[PDB]
Design a protein around this nucleic acid. Structure first.
Ligand SMILES: CCN(CC)C(=O)CCC(=O)NCCCN(CCCNC(=O)CCC(=O)N(CC)CC)C(=O)CCC(=O)NCC#Cc1cn([C@H]2C[C@H](O)[C@@H](COP(=O)(O)OP(=O)(O)OP(=O)(O)O)O2)c(=O)[nH]c1=O
Ligand SMILES: [Mg+2]
Ligand SMILES: [Mg+2]
Length: 539
DNA sequence: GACCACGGCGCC
DNA sequence: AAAAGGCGCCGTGGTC
């Protein structure tokens, strides 16, 4: 390409090199743009950012987040990553996409700019005639990248002092547990080492091994195994408590406080847009889509996520979203009727599980019940279910008969979906988002049937993901005009931040946007709460 | 210091 | 652990 002085003409593709992958933390080392057989290299990248109207090219969202961090309103535009991801969601990295569609991902901005231009041309070509994928690109993914950029640069407020204090308290409790574990073993060892624990439980103490690990066939010490052994030796309960506490402390309590950004004073995640097989987003660095919520200590941690002073958090969560999607995709009259009547399948199952009436099902019971509902829907075995519910195998097998019989046209949809996947080599969401599942023709049964479970889960999980993304795209500009903020997405949930005066109006508005995103054969219901912290906001 | 594979486990 | 699916991060163990 012909070397040409900065700045580039408008519509040029950008290339850029960060000192580290996280755009809120990165130094912009270099910046370039490419168009019309030219390549322009910015003498000083930060200053050159101001000359661009739009970030167009590979990882456009990351450069846009960096720009917002610097006070520049630079929105992301076309990104070949989004084109490739729609063509095949195993296209998750620029290294791979480059190799697959016409170049190499190097460490030089000018080369990355040229690459973006070339790859865009080629991938755009491949999407011609693919009208549904085109609609997903233009109406969903592309605008969604702009929304994600704002969410990332905005961040979420965290009560750091609270977490610091919590750490010291959990440390003492952890020591109480580990000391007792060592007393019971008769000697200390690295309790964090599942290999050392394996030998203590199964070789030294006389406990029966229950299961083996997947890759290396060691005797497993997983929570499920320990659960089954909870009454064979008092050390087992202590170990389970130890695991709970150390998991929460090492993953959330200790790391999160150290990740507060000096400029914003908030915590900033990344919402990865080309990272999953089904079309869901993922979150990393840190992952804010797996903040604890179940146990007492977990809830204490979620309480650390708080609203700016003068603001409130608003949490909105789609009700039984994948069951409703299933009703629509399958067209099952019984299931559709359930939602037209306003029934709650999770409460109902929770009612059967704990042997209480529906009004007796508390939040944590209902939670347990959804693991069972989706567990079964997506192929859980009779054997496993009996083990979890701690009931006879015959009771577990029975529950699964009744489950699929109540909703007769589901299996038809599953069989239709699997046959279709075998022929085309891929399955599809409602909107035509694709996932290739070649192992549907595998000759090994365990491999083939695992593939089948992935394949028929995908249209359901993926449609739910399409709906939520579309909702985010419609909702974002409405929040901007009300002076509220979109902060996080957790798959079928959004967390917004609104000024106190407008929080009620924002909650109502967001609820309606989410419910009316794309009407289905059953209503979509959204549960909404308002609060000073994330736990309170989910009520 | 960093990379991986693994087991394990937090959320949806 | 097991015929639920989708993720990312932790510490260990082994390298490099
Ligand atoms: C090989 C087979 N293998 C391997 C593992 C598996 O198949 C893998 C599965 C997996 O990887 N791990 C398994 C589950 C692990 N455990 C717990 C561990 C167990 N230890 C205890 O219980 C201890 C008890 C305890 O301490 N105490 C307190 C001390 C009490 C319990 C959790 O996830 C914990 C967290 C949790 O349950 N959070 C709920 C959940 C969930 C799921 C969601 N979805 C999809 C559809 C939904 O529609 C959509 C939206 O979700 P959501 O909005 O929520 O639901 P709805 O929209 O439908 O309903 P409403 O919005 O109306 O309410 O997402 C799934 O596909 N599967 C799901 O499980
Ligand atoms: Mg939900
Ligand atoms: Mg949810």
């Amino acid at each position: 390409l012909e070397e040409a002085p900065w700045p580039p003409p408008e519509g040029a593709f950008v290339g850029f090199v960060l000192s580290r992958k996280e755009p809120m933390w990165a130094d912009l080392l270099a910046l370039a743009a490419a168009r019309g057989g030219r390549v322009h290299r910015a003498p000083e990248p930060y200053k050159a950012l101001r000359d661009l109207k739009e970030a167009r090219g590979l990882l456009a969202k990351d450069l846009s987040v960096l720009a917002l961090r610097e006070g520049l309103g630079l929105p992301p535009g076309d990104d070949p990553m989004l084109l490739a991801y729609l063509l095949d969601p195993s296209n998750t990295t620029p290294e791979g996409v480059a190799r697959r569609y016409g170049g190499e991902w190097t460490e030089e901005a000018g080369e990355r700019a040229a690459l973006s231009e070339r790859l865009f041309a080629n991938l755009w070509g491949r999407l011609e005639g693919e009208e549904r994928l085109l609609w997903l690109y233009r109406e969903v993914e592309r605008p969604l990248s702009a929304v994600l950029a704002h969410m990332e640069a905005t961040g979420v407020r965290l009560d750091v002092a609270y977490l610091r204090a919590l750490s010291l308290e959990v440390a003492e409790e952890i020591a109480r547990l580990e000391a007792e574990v060592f007393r019971l073993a008769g000697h200390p060892f690295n309790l964090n080492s599942r290999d050392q624990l394996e030998r203590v439980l199964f070789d030294e103490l006389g406990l029966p091994a229950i299961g083996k690990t997947e890759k290396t066939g060691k005797r497993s010490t997983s929570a499920a195994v320990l659960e089954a052994l909870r009454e064979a030796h008092p050390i087992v309960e202590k170990i389970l408590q130890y695991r709970e506490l150390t998991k929460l402390k090492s993953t959330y309590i200790d790391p999160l406080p150290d990740l507060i950004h000096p400029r914003t004073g908030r915590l900033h995640t990344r919402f990865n847009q080309t990272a999953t097989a089904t079309g869901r987003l993922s979150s990393s660095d840190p992952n804010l889509q797996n903040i604890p919520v179940r146990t007492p200590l977990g809830q204490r941690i979620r309480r650390a996520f708080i609203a700016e002073e003068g603001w409130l958090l608003v949490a909105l969560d789609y009700s039984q979203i994948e069951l409703r999607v299933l009703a629509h995709l399958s067209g099952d009259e019984n299931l559709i009727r359930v939602f037209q009547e306003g029934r709650d399948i999770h409460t109902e199952t929770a009612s059967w599980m704990f042997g209480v009436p529906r009004e007796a099902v508390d939040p944590l019971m209902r939670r347990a019940a959804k693991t069972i509902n989706f567990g079964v829907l997506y192929g859980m075995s009779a054997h496993r279910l009996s083990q979890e519910l701690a009931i006879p195998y015959e009771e577990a097998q029975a529950f699964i008969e009744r489950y699929f019989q109540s909703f007769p046209k589901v299996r038809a949809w599953i069989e239709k979906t699997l046959e279709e996947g075998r022929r085309r080599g891929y399955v599809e969401t409602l909107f035509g988002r694709r996932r290739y599942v070649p192992d549907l023709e595998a000759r090994v049964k365990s491999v083939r049937e695992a593939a089948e479970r992935m394949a028929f889960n995908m249209p359901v999980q993926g449609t739910a993901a399409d709906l939520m993304k579309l909702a985010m795209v419609k909702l974002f500009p409405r929040l901007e005009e009300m002076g509220a903020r979109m902060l996080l997405q957790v798959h079928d949930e959004l967390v917004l931040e609104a000024p106190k005066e407008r929080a009620e109006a924002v909650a109502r508005l967001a609820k309606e946007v989410m419910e009316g995103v794309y009407p289905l054969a059953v209503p979509l219901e959204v549960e909404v709460g308002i609060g000073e912290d994330w736990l309170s906001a989910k009520e």
